[PDB]
Amino acid sequence: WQHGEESMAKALVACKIYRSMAYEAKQSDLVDDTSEELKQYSNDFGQLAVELLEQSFRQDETMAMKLLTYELKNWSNSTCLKLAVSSRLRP
Amino acid sequence: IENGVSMHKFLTIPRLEELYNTKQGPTNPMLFHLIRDVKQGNLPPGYKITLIDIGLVIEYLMGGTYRCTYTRKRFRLIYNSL
Amino acid sequence: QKSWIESTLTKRECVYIIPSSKDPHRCLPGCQICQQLVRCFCGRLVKQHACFTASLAMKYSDVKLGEHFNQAIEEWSVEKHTEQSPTDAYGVINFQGGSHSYRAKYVRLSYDTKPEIILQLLLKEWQMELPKLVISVHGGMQKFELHPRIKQLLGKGLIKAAVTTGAWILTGGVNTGVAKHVGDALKEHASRSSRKICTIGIAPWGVIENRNDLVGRDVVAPYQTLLNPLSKLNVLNNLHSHFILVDDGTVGKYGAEVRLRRELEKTINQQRIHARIGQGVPVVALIFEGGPNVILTVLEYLQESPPVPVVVCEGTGRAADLLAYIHKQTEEGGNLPDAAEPDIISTIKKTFNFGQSEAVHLFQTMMECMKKKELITVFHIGSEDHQDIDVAILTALLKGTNASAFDQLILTLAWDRVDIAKNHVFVYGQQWLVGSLEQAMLDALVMDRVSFVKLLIENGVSMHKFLTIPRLEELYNTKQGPTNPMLFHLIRDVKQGNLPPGYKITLIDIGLVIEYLMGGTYRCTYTRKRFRLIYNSLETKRFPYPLNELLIWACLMKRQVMARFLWQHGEESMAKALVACKIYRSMAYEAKQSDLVDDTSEELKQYSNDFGQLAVELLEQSFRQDETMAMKLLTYELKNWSNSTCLKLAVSSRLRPFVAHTCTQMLLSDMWMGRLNMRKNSWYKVILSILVPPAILMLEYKTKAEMSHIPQSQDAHQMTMELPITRKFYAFYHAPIVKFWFNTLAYLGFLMLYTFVVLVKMEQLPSVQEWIVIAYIFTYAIEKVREVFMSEAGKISQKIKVWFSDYFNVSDTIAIISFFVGFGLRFGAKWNYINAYDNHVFVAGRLIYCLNIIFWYVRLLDFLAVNQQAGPYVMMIGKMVANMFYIVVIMALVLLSFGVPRKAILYPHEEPSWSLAKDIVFHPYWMIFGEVYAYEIDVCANDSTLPTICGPGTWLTPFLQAVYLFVQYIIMVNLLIAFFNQVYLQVKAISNIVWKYQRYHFIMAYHEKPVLPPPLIILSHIVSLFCCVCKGPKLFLTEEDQKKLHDFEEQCVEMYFDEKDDKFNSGSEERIRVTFERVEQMSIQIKEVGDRVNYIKRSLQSLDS
Amino acid sequence: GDALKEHASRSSRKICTIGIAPWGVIENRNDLVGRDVVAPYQTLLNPLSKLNVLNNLHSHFILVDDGTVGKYGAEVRLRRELEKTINQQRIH
Ligand SMILES: CCCCCCCC/C=C/CCCCCCCC(=O)O[C@@H](COC(=O)CCCCCCCCCCCCCCC)COP(=O)([O-])OCC[N+](C)(C)C
Ligand SMILES: CCCCCCCC/C=C/CCCCCCCC(=O)O[C@@H](COC(=O)CCCCCCCCCCCCCCC)COP(=O)([O-])OCC[N+](C)(C)C
Ligand SMILES: CCCCCCCC/C=C/CCCCCCCC(=O)O[C@@H](COC(=O)CCCCCCCCCCCCCCC)COP(=O)([O-])OCC[N+](C)(C)C
């Protein structure tokens, strides 16, 4: 994650990928297990996206708002905000 | 990555497709269940994993109306071609 | 094309073919090997050029005839055959590596690119802000290597020196040489960490391997970072942020930058270094391992346009270290030991194979270098001289340019290096002509560098002779340095919101800003009559107390670190801190009010509370020494601060920890009593003495000595000067405690009568009781008019908005207005004589009184709020009622959710009627209070009280009401109670501070009221009117006492400052991280000694070898 | 005087410190002239003034106006006599 670009987006996708697998474990309820491990992995990346927002907002408030709303185009033409609402990532 | 490697010229389709479908090393029992559902809950007993069937996993995990770049028209063709 | 690089700047193309090293060899037929390797004196192949005009030789033969006389072959020159044809390499590199990207920029250009456009590329195009230092690095051009100690120490110093001065390092940009080792040092030291050491490499284009990659328009240049040693040409060092690359028009050739690199430096040391400062940007030059040309260019600095110093370090390699040798053994005039050239020329032949006669020339030129050693600097890294290359670098630019000590400070001031200034510029035995110090201080203050101001104040400067009217007026009106966007808005409003587009700022217009910020009726010393004249007119312009006027400046311009510093200096410390709290607090409001482009209010809010606590902590200190003197400090006129008072100032800022401090409280208690000694008397003896005046002469009064700390009136002062009987009554009826319990008893007797009037019938004319009521209310009103007009503010529209900003003054206005509507109807009615309550004008009058009286019972909560125990409960009730709005809206919704279906089910034949509005609220509201209307719920039951509204659907109403009460009586009432329970706990946590703060306005009110209460008060108004028509508290201190107070100030002003440092030194975890700081010098030096102990023991056996 | 400065002897404390000098020498003596005043001793370290800069840490300055200026040794006895009538009173 540290490497490349689109850091804030990659962190809010990851939070969504882990959070859904953390649900399908508790849903599928088969031989599989290890969901609260996934729950933690989502909240790990989730805080990373929040701490990048903080940083980016303390520099220029106006540009940070634009970061929450530009189309991504590597991520199904979605938005970092829209992704964070999917994960119910409240902070 | 510090000593001359670049991920740009090193991520080819057979390679990263390999890197998905290896039980060598820390392995997930969940992904093989995820590929089950999206593949109609029907596995060939061997069943090499493509990049394609993964794209349908993400579209199920990301939810809503997400469209992975692994299920697109261009990619789906050049994959078969290559 | 919007690509100024592409437009104005240009590249170079070999547009002609001159076979170089054309030696026909293998593969018998000529053309094949005459087409295999035929380089040019440009450096490329004819087949590698092709260049749209060089392709015309690939097909035929080299762009020339055949043999083509060798008298003419040699004649290349980039002047002759090279066409410019814009650049194609203005991208941005993405050097891949560690857990980051080391992004950098570049450009191609020619060796004769103008020195001004290269600047217009660095600053204008690349946004790079002009430096205050340049480090021209000229060392080894091959892969030289060093050892660990020098690897770290030299690294830090070179880095740190660039950190402080925001410098621009200059290298070749190639990781075979200095650039590798320059760049490395940045890597480990974390110079990037919320920071940038701007770093640039002037290289040539043709060499840098994968140059063809970087080709192309603006792109994320995928420079591949391959360390493949096959590519000797070079790997661009991936730490340098910028790469100017001299596309001279050659490839494989070297030395395209040697002049340009210098010329750029020449036109870097030719611009100003922050306009307040007038100097050229100084330029050092350093030397690492280095070759014979690296020593050669030292002779190109020492004897060059404005002399450029040299910082050859010790211990690096062949060049940098050898120049220390010739430095060391040779005198200040370069006087060699005569056997030097007879044994150094071995060193040259030892280090280099440069030769012997060659080597003789080297040392000879190397002394031609060393003819002036006042200007070079051997950083003796061994023996730790300057202890980082930095201190030698910066010092090197302050010695050897025949510069003056003012010209030496002024540079240190520009750099943020006091340590350089105090240790070198402020050296024993220095000149400092007349106003050099003074000119530096006008520079240090406007630039907001306290640490130089602090130093200068210690090193001969005095603010007393340095604050002149043009000067401090200058110091206001400078956008150089940290600038306030708020003050220019403040000057707008006070200047009618009209700006001349230029509009130089005066001292005068500022005075109107302070009078707007301090508020009320403050009068700055800049708007006075004398000052306003001498200003226009203009020796005497030296400001009797300058440190007062600069503290205003630093605060009006949000220069806290300057404000907080200047506050320490001078006198009137406690006052200056309570003004500052007021200035910032008002700007912190006008930001949130003006709400324009401006911002940064919570920063001001914090600045106010910073100074506020300072005034509180001085009060503490001053009170723990002598309680009585501290009280006098809260009440002496200031006379530099609009004849105000430190207490009065702190009330303006609503600075509660100061007013709720036990010093003020003990003083507020002493003003409450007056000349009554209530520690001996009691409040029941005061009440008795009001109702029985002769007991007044039985009470224990006070002298002048135990009343000297108390601010008194002119009279209360004077009546004590000249204890007889008439003076014993004057002491009693003029105390605030008496005026309270004398208005309180009249107010209680007012309500007893006014209660009697509403409960007893009214005949046509008022009774004696009702007249006494009307008299109270009438005069009570006049009393309220006066305390508006005789308020503290000056603008009537602000005397008004403050008074109506209290709950009980709004209620009294309604209670007074509503009473005389009632009196006018009660009295102006035509009596009926058959029955009083048939005339509806008389009834409306009586019914207004009976509701009017509720205002007057509730005004008693204001009397009770005076008590320390009751007042917190009056605060609660208001906060409960004010903030329960939204729970009660839900409750009213739940109510109609039930009341409307019930009325609709039970009463289905209803025409529209006003009763429908009553019957949907009435019974559902009384349910809230536990009335379930038990015999009305089921209306078809035998025990029903409503057997007639039985009908279809009525069986639904029990189910409805069961749900309603569960929701209403249990959920919603206890949700409201839960809210109220938290209000309770919140108020009790703050109740005592707020009570203590409100004693001030309370006690000062009853210091200004008349001595007669509202029925009899009219005589006090009359006498206090015809006095003025015909014709407040001050601490009167004699000069003998007024003097000692100032002595008590300074002593306690002093003892405070000393204390804070002393406790702060000790600390708790500070001490633990002061230990950890000490854990290094031990570990270093336990490695110092521990390095030698192995050097010791090897000796001992070698001495016995 | 220096040693008092760094050591923070002032810190909630006073080391009482006195300098018996002569009046005539101390440069800017003419400044200190005048009745009870905040003597604006300017602290100029200008080395032109050899005569002396009063060290700014000593709290008290008895200055022997013997009736000379540029002369030296006005205190040599007085300084001692003060000490003689300091070692002549009781010690609590
Ligand atoms: C910043 C300040 C802060 C402090 C606040 C202070 C401000 C307080 C402000 C107070 C304002 C009070 C306004 C009163 C208006 C009365 C209206 C009314 O109903 O009139 C009635 C009588 O009108 C008359 O003129 C006859 C009654 C005699 C005059 C008594 C009212 C004036 C007293 C004023 C004393 C002012 C007190 C203040 C003194 C300083 C009209 O009705 P009617 O004629 O009865 O009807 C006739 C019908 N019929 C013929 C069928 C019978
Ligand atoms: C700030 C706090 C709350 C918000 C403020 C706003 C509150 C909203 C206020 C709403 C008021 C209701 C409308 C009143 C108008 C209708 C009355 C009328 O004209 O007729 C009735 C008389 O009425 C009376 O005699 C007075 C009855 C008033 C009851 C108010 C108290 C109940 C609680 C209310 C508090 C709930 C608060 C909810 C909080 C949980 C009778 O009908 P009629 O046609 O006259 O019949 C004549 C024949 N007869 C003589 C046989 C009868
Ligand atoms: C716990 C204790 C209760 C026992 C439990 C078992 C339920 C027992 C219930 C059984 C339902 C059968 C009883 C009604 C039959 C008609 C009788 C009658 O006179 O009705 C009267 C009203 O009432 C009605 O007309 C209907 C009342 C239905 C209320 C039951 C709701 C479900 C209760 C919970 C379900 C339980 C399980 C779920 C619990 C989680 C008719 O009218 P009136 O009011 O006389 O007056 C109107 C005018 N008149 C006089 C002209 C007519």
Ligand SMILES: CCCCCCCC/C=C\CCCCCCCC(=O)O[C@@H](COC(=O)CCCCCCCCCCCCCCC)COP(=O)([O-])OCC[N+](C)(C)C
């Ligand atoms: C403004 C409030 C302040 C506090 C209270 C102040 C007043 C407290 C003092 C007393 C309260 C009671 C007042 C007297 C009532 C007399 C009753 C009457 O009508 O006639 C009577 C006598 O009446 C007289 O003798 C006339 C008195 C002249 C006015 C006196 C004003 C003094 C107070 C000026 C203000 C300054 C003093 C205070 C300064 C702090 C005969 O009685 P009755 O009629 O058989 O009985 C009444 C019953 N009834 C209504 C059923 C008929």
Ligand SMILES: CCCCCCCC/C=C\CCCCCCCC(=O)O[C@@H](COC(=O)CCCCCCCCCCCCCCC)COP(=O)([O-])OCC[N+](C)(C)C
């Ligand atoms: C004869 C009998 C017949 C006549 C009967 C008349 C009926 C009686 C009528 C009214 C009650 C009498 C007193 C007036 C109310 C208090 C005003 C107030 O809150 O002032 C305060 C604020 O002021 C404001 O905030 C200004 C705007 C008002 C706020 C909304 C509530 C009041 C509006 C009306 C709503 C009810 C409708 C009533 C109006 C028609 C100033 O006080 P403070 O100490 O600064 O505290 C404020 C702190 N705070 C700002 C942070 C909160």
Ligand SMILES: CCCCCCCC/C=C\CCCCCCCC(=O)O[C@@H](COC(=O)CCCCCCCCCCCCCCC)COP(=O)([O-])OCC[N+](C)(C)C
């Ligand atoms: C800010 C100032 C506001 C108010 C200013 C002043 C307003 C002036 C107001 C009134 C003056 C009008 C005088 C009378 C007019 C003609 C009618 C008449 O004479 O008789 C009629 C009176 O009818 C009524 O309704 C009388 C009551 C009206 C006042 C209501 C309260 C207003 C104040 C609210 C409080 C405000 C508090 C605000 C505090 C901030 C009927 O009576 P009758 O003749 O006996 O009946 C004949 C019929 N019969 C044969 C069937 C019996």
Ligand SMILES: CCCCCCCC/C=C\CCCCCCCC(=O)O[C@@H](COC(=O)CCCCCCCCCCCCCCC)COP(=O)([O-])OCC[N+](C)(C)C
């Ligand atoms: C005719 C009946 C009237 C009497 C009512 C009897 C009932 C009980 C009544 C009241 C108890 C309170 C009285 C004694 C308080 C003394 C001490 C005190 O609190 O001091 C305070 C002042 O004093 C006040 O603030 C008291 C307020 C007096 C007005 C009372 C109106 C409400 C009661 C009316 C009735 C409504 C309820 C219905 C009942 C009819 C604080 O001020 P201070 O300057 O700090 O004080 C001295 C200095 N020291 C304290 C720091 C040392």
Ligand SMILES: CCCCCCCC/C=C\CCCCCCCC(=O)O[C@@H](COC(=O)CCCCCCCCCCCCCCC)COP(=O)([O-])OCC[N+](C)(C)C
């Ligand atoms: C005849 C009938 C019986 C009479 C009843 C007895 C008389 C009534 C009793 C108590 C009256 C209130 C006491 C005030 C105490 C002082 C408060 C104060 O200074 O400021 C407060 C505001 O103040 C308000 O909000 C005032 C309250 C609004 C009007 C009261 C209506 C009462 C009924 C409504 C209920 C009925 C609803 C439902 C009905 C259906 C402060 O509030 P804050 O902003 O959070 O704090 C800021 C602090 N500050 C003070 C420094 C600014």
Ligand SMILES: CCCCCCCC/C=C\CCCCCCCC(=O)O[C@@H](COC(=O)CCCCCCCCCCCCCCC)COP(=O)([O-])OCC[N+](C)(C)C
């Ligand atoms: C039978 C019980 C079934 C089992 C019970 C359980 C099933 C519950 C369902 C229903 C309960 C039974 C209703 C029958 C009423 C019989 C009485 C009757 O006819 O009354 C009247 C008509 O009454 C109606 O027409 C009622 C119509 C239904 C209203 C909608 C209910 C929705 C409940 C929402 C559900 C949410 C539940 C809570 C959610 C958590 C007429 O007869 P009367 O009263 O004599 O009036 C006088 C007649 N006269 C004009 C001739 C003079």
Ligand SMILES: C[C@@H]1CC[C@@]2(OC1)O[C@H]1C[C@H]3[C@@H]4CC=C5C[C@@H](OCCC(CO)CO)CC[C@]5(C)[C@H]4CC[C@]3(C)[C@H]1[C@@H]2C
């Ligand atoms: C708030 C203020 C407190 C003080 C005060 O004002 C209000 O309170 C008032 C109440 C008045 C009394 C009420 C009623 C009567 C009864 C009547 O006689 C009845 C018949 C008899 C036959 O045998 C049996 O009782 C005589 C007069 C008297 C006593 C009043 C006197 C004045 C008084 C004390 C007033 C006093 C000035």
Ligand SMILES: C[C@@H]1CC[C@@]2(OC1)O[C@H]1C[C@H]3[C@@H]4CC=C5C[C@@H](OCCC(CO)CO)CC[C@]5(C)[C@H]4CC[C@]3(C)[C@H]1[C@@H]2C
């Ligand atoms: C969001 C909230 C939803 C509920 C609610 O608030 C808002 O919606 C309001 C609408 C109101 C009604 C409007 C019109 C009339 C007509 C009038 O008829 C004349 C009388 C006649 C005498 O005979 C003339 O001669 C009688 C009153 C009535 C029915 C109102 C009652 C209260 C109601 C229901 C209010 C209720 C509290």
Ligand SMILES: CC(C)CCC[C@@H](C)[C@H]1CC[C@H]2[C@@H]3CC=C4C[C@@H](O)CC[C@]4(C)[C@H]3CC[C@]12C
């Ligand atoms: C709507 C009209 C016609 C009917 C009567 C309205 C009622 C609600 C009015 C009449 C008298 C009013 C009271 C008059 C006096 C005060 C004192 C004040 O400090 C708070 C409000 C309070 C307590 C009022 C509350 C509302 C009140 C009780």
